[PDB]
Structures are given as structure tokens and as C-alpha cells.
Amino acid sequence: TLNGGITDMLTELANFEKNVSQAIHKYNAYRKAASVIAKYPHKIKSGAEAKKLPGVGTKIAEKIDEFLATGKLRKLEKIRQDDTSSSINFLTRVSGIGPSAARKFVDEGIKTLEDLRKNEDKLNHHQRIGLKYFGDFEKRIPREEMLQMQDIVLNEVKKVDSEYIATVCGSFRRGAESSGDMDVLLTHPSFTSESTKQPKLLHQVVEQLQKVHFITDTLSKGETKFMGVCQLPSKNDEKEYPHRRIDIRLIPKDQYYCGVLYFTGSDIFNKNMRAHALEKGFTINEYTIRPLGVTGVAGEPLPVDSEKDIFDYIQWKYREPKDRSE
DNA sequence: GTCGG
DNA sequence: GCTGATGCGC
DNA sequence: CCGACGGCGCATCAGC
Ligand SMILES: Nc1ccn([C@H]2C[C@H](O)[C@@H](COP(=O)(O)OP(=O)(O)OP(=O)(O)O)O2)c(=O)n1
Ligand SMILES: Nc1ccn([C@H]2C[C@H](O)[C@@H](COP(=O)(O)OP(=O)(O)OP(=O)(O)O)O2)c(=O)n1
Ligand SMILES: *CC[C@H](OP(*)(=O)O)[C@H](O)COP(=O)(O)O
Ligand SMILES: [Ca+2]
Ligand SMILES: [Ca+2]
Ligand SMILES: [Ca+2]
């Protein structure tokens, strides 16, 4: 990729700040800078050139000058060599181990994959599943497998109730040739912002997918959000497909557009769009767009009849899902 | 770490 | 049990 | 310089 050296440097810094320093605003600053540089259509020749971009300040310009002159960054060189950093950066790759749990495990002398497998009794349900499928969850999902997965989920949901609509969102809906996981937005007319006329609406879909051995494990489950594990069926004598992460979010049917905007992302696109909405005097979540009073108190939800209406309120030209990726 | 007031 | 904080997730 | 930085679901735990 153009400027791939710089954007990789910035992503490594972002992850260090998140996982090791526990500094969420530096994590987000580095990612916002990586994303703006990834879209810049020239090979960056200096830090001064990069610093012209919004989200690139003095300190990133200085690291770009070091990286362009030497091909490395001394700060990352040191982070790679530091045992506590290295240990924490590894443990946080396990689903369910965040920065706080990683540091606590390193304190207890639990620092390698072999230490985790010796200590399953010290992991919660989520972490145990994270560890079981550590390699599988590393692997990306080809679009060809995502289409197979779509066909199973859409067909099994129709078997439960023809009135469900299931939409595959995330990087898949942005047209990606591969996905990190599957994200399914679910609506049913019985669940609106005015009423739940039927219990178990998410549960009955989870149950059906478990029944046909598509959903294999559960990391977390409530009334509106499932987070778990799924797997494609394989043929006679064939190697099994890797286990995959799946998220299902049940959104009130009348708030589909806000919900599909949220679930389509990217996450960096959502942060950028929601920060732009605040500048314009609105707040966006997965349900509504609301004005802000001078007070900073959100007013009543605004009428939304398309994704594009949300862009119109905040005076952005529409971006098709494919133009919302980094 | 960066930006805008 | 409930409520609010925090961790980890989307 | 300095306040703000997106917004929210589920799991877990402390205090009552
Ligand atoms: N911090 C986050 C994480 C995610 N999301 C939203 C936008 C994402 O598009 C969607 C699903 O999140 P994923 O982490 O599954 O991301 P993607 O599907 O975009 O990418 P990948 O290909 O890695 O799954 O949820 C968000 O708004 N804020
Ligand atoms: N041990 C510490 C360190 C810092 N602080 C507070 C004081 C400041 O509000 C901020 C950090 O102060 P610094 O010395 O880092 O620099 P400032 O930015 O406060 O300096 P100035 O006010 O000159 O900008 O956190 C604190 O209460 N206790
Ligand atoms: C990258 C340089 C750092 O920018 P931020 O406020 O995280 C600072 O200049 C501190 O330098 P460090 O000694 O590299 O952390
Ligand atoms: Ca995804
Ligand atoms: Ca996901
Ligand atoms: Ca949200």
C-alpha cells in the first residue's frame, strides 16, 4: 500500500497506547492519523507534508521524519524489546483479555500461550473461548465464505419467522474482499422503539442457528446483542472451516437506518461522523439523530427515512458503504 | 496526540 | 437483589 | 493554553 510503512508504524503506536499505556485518546489520535494518511493519494516525502493533513500534528510529523530517514522508529524498537510490553501486547490478542486483564496475568507470571493453557481455571468463560480458538480468530474470512455464511443465517432466520429481516453489515456491507468477522443486524416488526410485543426475539434466532450447528459457542448474550462463535459445515473428507466470530444486534424496526449506519462502520468512520455531528449540533447513536440544546441536552429524535437523511442533517455529501472503509 | 475556540 | 462503576466488546 | 475526544450492550463486582 502507498504510505504502508507510515500507517503500520502509526497502528503499532496506537495499539501500544491502548494495550500497554491504557491511553485511549492517544490510541484514537494515532488511528485517526493512520486513516487520514492511508487515504492520501501521494507517497509522503516528509513529516511537514503529512502535517498538512487533519489529525497529523507536530509529534506524528517528527515520527514520520525519523521513519522516512531510518526506516524504523527508536520508540517502537524499544517497545518490541521490553518484556512487559511484549507480554501484554500478546495477551490482548486473546478475545476477552483486555489491557487490564493482560497486565494482571503478567503480574501472576501468566505471559505466553503455554501459560494460558496451563491456567484455564483462572480464565472467565469469554477468555476460555478466546484461547480455544486463538488461531482461528487470527484468520480472515474470504468474501466467498462470508456469502455462504450469509445464505445460512438468512435462510435459518426465514425458517423461524418470515417477518425477520437479517442484514450482514460491517466490512462485508462495505464490499471488503475479506472480513475479520460476521456482523448481522436483525429486525422484526414486533420490536420497535414504541414496544416489544414478543419476548425471545433474538433468543429464538440464536437457538435456530445453534440447532443447525452454525453457532457453536456463546461469549455474551442479552435481549438485543449476541456475541459468539460460528462455523461453516464442511463436506465428506474435507478439513473443517475455521471457527469465526459472529455478532448479532436486534435493532428496533423503525430505527433501521440509524442502526445500519452504525453497524456498517467503519469504526473510524463512525467516530469521525459522530464528532462531525457534535460540531453541527447533533448527536448520533445506533437508534436516533437528535439536536443538542445550548445546554448540551439532546432534544427529540429527528425523522429519518434513509441512511442519506442522516448525512443531510450534518451537511455531509452521502458516502456509499464502500467509501466508509480505511 | 490533536484540534479549535 | 439493586445500582453504579469498570472492563471488554461492537 | 486547555477541554474534549462517539456512543452503547453485556459481564462482573463493590457497596448497601
Ligand atoms: N469501536 C467500534 C467498533 C465497531 N463499531 C461498528 C462499526 C463496525 O463496522 C461494526 C462492526 O465492527 P467490527 O469490529 O466487526 O468491524 P468491521 O466489520 O468494520 O471490520 P472487520 O473486517 O475487522 O470485521 O460495528 C463501532 O461503531 N465502534
Ligand atoms: N502528580 C500530579 C501531576 C499532575 N497533576 C495535575 C496538575 C495539572 O492539572 C496536570 C498535569 O500538570 P503538568 O505538570 O503535567 O502540566 P500542566 O499542563 O498542568 O502545566 P501548565 O498548567 O503550565 O500547562 O495534572 C496532579 O494533580 N498531580
Ligand atoms: C511520540 C512522542 C510523544 O507524543 P505523545 O504526547 O504520546 C511524546 O513526545 C512523549 O515521548 P515518549 O517519551 O516517546 O513517550
Ligand atoms: Ca466485522
Ligand atoms: Ca464484529
Ligand atoms: Ca452507539
Side-chain angles (χ1 to χ4, degrees), chain A residues 2-73 75-77 79-117 119 121-158 160-199 201-210 212-293 295-299 301-316 318-326:
Chain A
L2 196 44
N3 307 306
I6 292 162
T7 63
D8 283 351
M9 172 186 68
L10 296 178
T11 302
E12 195 168 345
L13 286 172
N15 284 334
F16 166 84
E17 291 305 351
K18 192 161 60 52
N19 296 322
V20 178
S21 305
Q22 307 193 246
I24 201 71
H25 304 294
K26 290 180 178 198
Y27 160 79
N28 288 322
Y30 280 125
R31 287 188 94 214
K32 170 176 184 198
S35 182
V36 69
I37 288 167
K39 290 161 186 152
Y40 179 69
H42 312 272
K43 189 173 130 155
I44 287 158
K45 310 218 185 97
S46 67
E49 174 185 359
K51 188 191 183 160
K52 304 189 92 63
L53 296 174
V56 177
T58 301
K59 285 185 182 194
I60 294 173
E62 282 179 48
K63 295 193 209 318
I64 290 171
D65 284 332
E66 177 169 357
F67 177 87
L68 282 166
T70 72
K72 77 185 39 167
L73 192 70
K75 187 191 170 79
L76 282 180
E77 238 219 317
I79 288 166
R80 286 174 185 193
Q81 276 23 278
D82 177 63
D83 288 335
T84 297
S85 293
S86 276
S87 291
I88 289 168
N89 276 325
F90 173 64
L91 289 180
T92 56
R93 289 164 61 190
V94 179
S95 185
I97 309 186
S100 174
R103 198 173 272 284
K104 191 192 113 73
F105 286 132
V106 170
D107 290 351
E108 300 179 60
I110 302 178
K111 318 183 131 157
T112 68
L113 180 67
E114 302 75 16
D115 296 333
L116 286 169
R117 289 168 165 164
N119 286 292
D121 59 336
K122 285 177 162 60
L123 305 184
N124 72 25
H125 177 67
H126 187 144
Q127 294 167 338
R128 275 186 260 237
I129 298 314
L131 175 64
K132 172 172 185 205
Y133 297 119
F134 177 70
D136 281 1
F137 288 177
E138 287 315 84
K139 293 182 157 74
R140 305 184 55 80
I141 310 179
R143 190 175 186 87
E144 304 58 49
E145 288 180 36
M146 289 292 282
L147 289 173
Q148 296 172 253
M149 292 165 75
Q150 176 177 242
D151 189 77
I152 295 168
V153 172
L154 265 63
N155 275 286
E156 288 309 311
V157 162
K158 180 151 204 268
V160 177
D161 184 330
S162 65
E163 299 198 304
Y164 289 107
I165 307 156
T167 306
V168 179
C169 302
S171 58
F172 173 88
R173 181 170 189 265
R174 303 197 303 269
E177 269 306 329
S178 71
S179 292
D181 80 354
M182 179 168 262
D183 310 293
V184 191
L185 189 54
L186 193 65
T187 61
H188 186 288
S190 279
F191 174 50
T192 73
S193 69
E194 290 304 323
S195 185
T196 313
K197 314 200 154 190
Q198 202 163 319
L201 279 179
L202 179 51
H203 181 75
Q204 294 178 77
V205 162
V206 173
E207 175 172 60
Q208 178 66 10
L209 291 169
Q210 281 168 336
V212 305
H213 299 98
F214 184 65
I215 288 173
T216 59
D217 311 75
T218 301
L219 300 168
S220 76
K221 189 178 179 279
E223 298 299 312
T224 62
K225 191 176 69 87
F226 174 84
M227 186 170 331
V229 185
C230 64
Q231 184 193 35
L232 287 176
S234 52
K235 308 292 186 60
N236 282 346
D237 278 9
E238 286 197 356
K239 198 149 109 312
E240 293 200 347
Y241 285 99
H243 285 76
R244 304 312 193 169
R245 277 279 292 103
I246 180 158
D247 298 310
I248 305 169
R249 188 66 192 277
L250 176 64
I251 297 295
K253 190 176 168 65
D254 60 304
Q255 293 177 334
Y256 170 73
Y257 294 117
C258 282
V260 78
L261 178 67
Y262 157 60
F263 224 27
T264 294
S266 76
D267 58 331
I268 291 169
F269 171 83
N270 294 342
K271 281 159 99 306
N272 284 347
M273 180 164 189
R274 298 178 176 195
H276 187 75
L278 288 173
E279 284 159 20
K280 289 288 173 176
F282 302 84
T283 177
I284 299 170
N285 64 22
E286 63 264 57
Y287 307 121
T288 65
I289 179 163
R290 296 166 294 157
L292 285 290
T295 168
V297 174
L302 301 163
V304 172
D305 273 279
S306 69
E307 282 183 87
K308 177 167 117 61
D309 285 354
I310 305 163
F311 286 78
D312 288 335
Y313 281 123
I314 70 170
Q315 306 188 282
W316 265 13
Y318 184 62
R319 268 138 256 194
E320 294 291 341
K322 50 285 342 169
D323 302 310
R324 304 176 198 168
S325 298
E326 155 184 11

